[PDB]
Design an enzyme around this catalytic site. Structure first.
Site, PDB file in Angstrom:
ATOM      1  N   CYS A 114      14.158  31.467  26.668  1.00  0.00           N
ATOM      2  CA  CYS A 114      14.394  31.750  25.256  1.00  0.00           C
ATOM      3  C   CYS A 114      13.065  32.230  24.719  1.00  0.00           C
ATOM      4  O   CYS A 114      12.033  31.699  25.115  1.00  0.00           O
ATOM      5  CB  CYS A 114      14.750  30.434  24.529  1.00  0.00           C
ATOM      6  SG  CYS A 114      15.021  30.612  22.701  1.00  0.00           S
TER       7      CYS A 114
ATOM      8  N   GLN B 128      25.159  26.798  18.909  1.00  0.00           N
ATOM      9  CA  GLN B 128      26.335  26.472  19.776  1.00  0.00           C
ATOM     10  C   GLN B 128      26.525  24.975  19.765  1.00  0.00           C
ATOM     11  O   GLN B 128      25.511  24.240  19.829  1.00  0.00           O
ATOM     12  CB  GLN B 128      26.071  26.932  21.219  1.00  0.00           C
ATOM     13  CG  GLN B 128      26.337  28.446  21.394  1.00  0.00           C
ATOM     14  CD  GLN B 128      26.009  28.944  22.761  1.00  0.00           C
ATOM     15  OE1 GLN B 128      26.657  28.541  23.757  1.00  0.00           O
ATOM     16  NE2 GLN B 128      25.021  29.848  22.845  1.00  0.00           N
TER      17      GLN B 128
ATOM     18  N   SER C  19      24.439  30.233  26.829  1.00  0.00           N
ATOM     19  CA  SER C  19      23.155  30.936  27.146  1.00  0.00           C
ATOM     20  C   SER C  19      22.557  30.492  28.449  1.00  0.00           C
ATOM     21  O   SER C  19      21.727  31.225  28.994  1.00  0.00           O
ATOM     22  CB  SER C  19      22.085  30.790  26.023  1.00  0.00           C
ATOM     23  OG  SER C  19      22.596  31.306  24.763  1.00  0.00           O
TER      24      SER C  19
END
Ligand SMILES: O=C(O)CCc1nc2ccccc2[nH]1
Length: 113
Positions: free
Chosen positions: A63, A81, A104
């Site tokens: 990330c 999420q 992700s």
């Protein structure tokens, strides 16, 4: 429950992730199995003391919050999420999650505020 928590995280993506590239790797090629092994390897090194959560996240998180040593800032419910939101809100400040699964990839989370 506070309105908002602040957390840092370390994301490991894999080849079946929603978006399989990152700032540090043009195409994510590792299998989901290898991603969970990495995450668990991180948990055990942070637990023994050999590694520091925020140093690992600045080097190895998929990330781009890696540049902020994993820090995502504060967030309310309904922004992240759901599995990530739920693990974050269930931590005490200073406490680290186990493996957390989202579209992700696989995360560990450190609640800071
Ligand atoms: O690079 C991306 O596609 C976004 C990475 C990412 N996905 C997340 C899901 C939940 C929390 C933090 C997250 N960071």
């Amino acid at each position: 429950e506070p309105a908002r928590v602040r957390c840092s995280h370390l994301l490991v993506k894999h080849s079946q992730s929603r978006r399989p590239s990152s700032w540090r790797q043009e195409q994510i090629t590792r299998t989901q199995e290898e991603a969970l092994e990495l995450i668990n390897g991180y948990i055990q090194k942070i637990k023994s003391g050999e590694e520091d959560f925020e140093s690992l996240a600045s080097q190895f998180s998929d990330c781009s919050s890696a540049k902020a040593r994993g820090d995502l800032g504060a967030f309310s419910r309904g922004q992240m999420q759901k599995p990530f939101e739920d693990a974050s809100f269930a931590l005490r400040t200073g406490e680290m999650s186990g493996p957390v699964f989202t579209d992700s990839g696989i995360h560990i989370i450190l609640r800071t505020e």
